[PDB]
Amino acid sequence: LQKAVEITYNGKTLRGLLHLPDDVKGKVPLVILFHGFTGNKVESHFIFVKLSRALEKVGIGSVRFDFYGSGESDGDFSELTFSSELEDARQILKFVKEQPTTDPERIGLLGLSLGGAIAGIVAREYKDEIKALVLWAPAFNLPELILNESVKQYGAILEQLGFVDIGGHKLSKDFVEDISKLNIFELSKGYDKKVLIVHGTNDEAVEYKVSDRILKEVYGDNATRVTIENADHTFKSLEWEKKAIEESVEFFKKELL
Amino acid sequence: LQKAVEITYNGKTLRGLLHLPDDVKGKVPLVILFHGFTGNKVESHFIFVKLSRALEKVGIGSVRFDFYGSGESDGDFSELTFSSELEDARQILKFVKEQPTTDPERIGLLGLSLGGAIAGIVAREYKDEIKALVLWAPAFNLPELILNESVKQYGAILEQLGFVDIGGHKLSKDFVEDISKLNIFELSKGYDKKVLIVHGTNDEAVEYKVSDRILKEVYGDNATRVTIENADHTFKSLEWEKKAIEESVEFFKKELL
Numbered sequence: 001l002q003k004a005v006e007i008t009y010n011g012k013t014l015r016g017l018l019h020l021p022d023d024v025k026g027k028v029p030l031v032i033l034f035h036g037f038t039g040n041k042v043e044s045h046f047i048f049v050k051l052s053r054a055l056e057k058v059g060i061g062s063v064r065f066d067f068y069g070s071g072e073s074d075g076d077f078s079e080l081t082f083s084s085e086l087e088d089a090r091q092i093l094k095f096v097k098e099q100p101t102t103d104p105e106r107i108g109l110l111g112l113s114l115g116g117a118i119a120g121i122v123a124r125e126y127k128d129e130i131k132a133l134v135l136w137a138p139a140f141n142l143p144e145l146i147l148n149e150s151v152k153q154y155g156a157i158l159e160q161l162g163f164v165d166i167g168g169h170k171l172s173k174d175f176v177e178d179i180s181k182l183n184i185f186e187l188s189k190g191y192d193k194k195v196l197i198v199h200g201t202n203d204e205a206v207e208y209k210v211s212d213r214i215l216k217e218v219y220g221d222n223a224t225r226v227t228i229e230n231a232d233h234t235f236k237s238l239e240w241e242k243k244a245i246e247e248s249v250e251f252f253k254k255e256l257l
Numbered sequence: 258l259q260k261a262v263e264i265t266y267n268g269k270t271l272r273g274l275l276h277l278p279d280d281v282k283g284k285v286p287l288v289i290l291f292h293g294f295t296g297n298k299v300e301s302h303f304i305f306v307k308l309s310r311a312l313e314k315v316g317i318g319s320v321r322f323d324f325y326g327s328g329e330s331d332g333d334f335s336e337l338t339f340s341s342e343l344e345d346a347r348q349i350l351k352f353v354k355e356q357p358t359t360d361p362e363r364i365g366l367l368g369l370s371l372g373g374a375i376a377g378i379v380a381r382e383y384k385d386e387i388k389a390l391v392l393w394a395p396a397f398n399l400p401e402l403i404l405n406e407s408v409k410q411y412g413a414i415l416e417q418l419g420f421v422d423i424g425g426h427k428l429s430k431d432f433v434e435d436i437s438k439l440n441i442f443e444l445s446k447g448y449d450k451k452v453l454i455v456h457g458t459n460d461e462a463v464e465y466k467v468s469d470r471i472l473k474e475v476y477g478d479n480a481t482r483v484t485i486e487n488a489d490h491t492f493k494s495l496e497w498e499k500k501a502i503e504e505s506v507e508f509f510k511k512e513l514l
Contacts, residue, residue, distance in 0.1 A: 045425025
């Protein structure tokens, strides 16, 4: 079952999609998916919708929302910041628990790159409430990346212009300053339930070595990594995409149930 | 205002968004927006939402649906054909006509790339029903590209596997045979109302010189072409984005109203 949902907090309205398995009723496990930098709820080559529909086939619900300033939700990219989506994420988890079909003891999280950073942080905020977590190409090094991409380049423009054109989006200078005082590695530490990392070897957005850091620094032996050899950032292949979703569904099927 | 909508025909469910102007009330001009190959209703860097929300400021509503097998709508890319999305387009136009806020006389059409080819065909299909037509980098030569792409590498793969991986999607073999019998130039010929063409000088998906072909072989005095100097396919820049959306809404508001 697929139908669109709406969230409104403050003066912000969020738009998204909720999935529920048709053949089983009562209270069902749920995974909340967080999208990445400049992405949206469908995500790259529809990998989120695909993963959503694969989950309802194994009796597992899901919700996919558009972060404020991106996609179908309200706002401009300029009034968006990392901590903004952090507030958005909390409202989505709240909304999900307030569903009669939602099982409170079985809730998981999934995030892709920037969404992965948000997912690992929100997982620690609700360490008891989130039973399992999956990180696709987790961009825990987004802070250094933005800072090192703001001094080698864009630095003069951002101050002069107030923003910079990343590619049809207005990257505000507020965004650079807000993520400057955030450390994803130290902010995701403290999650103790099972963790699954999916990373591509030939990832040029978030180099594969980041997952090594996340495995050594952030989580203990409660986190495993599924390495997809030769894959790119978003697993842009029918083969790569299959492995990423299948291992994610298997992982959610075991740890969530 | 923006609300999610749904169309269900022939066992297929289409999901989308309907934009309605808050200021004006009663009956209001609508602009149907068709997205491109491997895209979705939000389109690249959210240009469709931007165009939609910029449209409602003029008091001009719009409807943005995901084609069947794409984005939020049902089905996989494997069951998608050009004629498949032509059928979807007809269903979307019937949907807009059925809405009480909608005014039948002033419906408009917009399409990007393959969506523009869809829009050009549908505009001629309902010549008297569609008041104006806007085309963003219209891929009228899409059948030629796919044909030439198939002989270079797709066809050998498609013959055996039944499909080809075009980057996380399954391109049907029927899709190639389906589009081979199609000539968008002649199919879009015969529209007798005002047409606007927005094309990029540095467009690499759909060459700039095919916009020359459309103005000559497809239309006459009613056709107009805005040239975005040095722009790429989707106007992936805030300066290029402004020119395309600003000029197109002025074309819409003038001839629709």
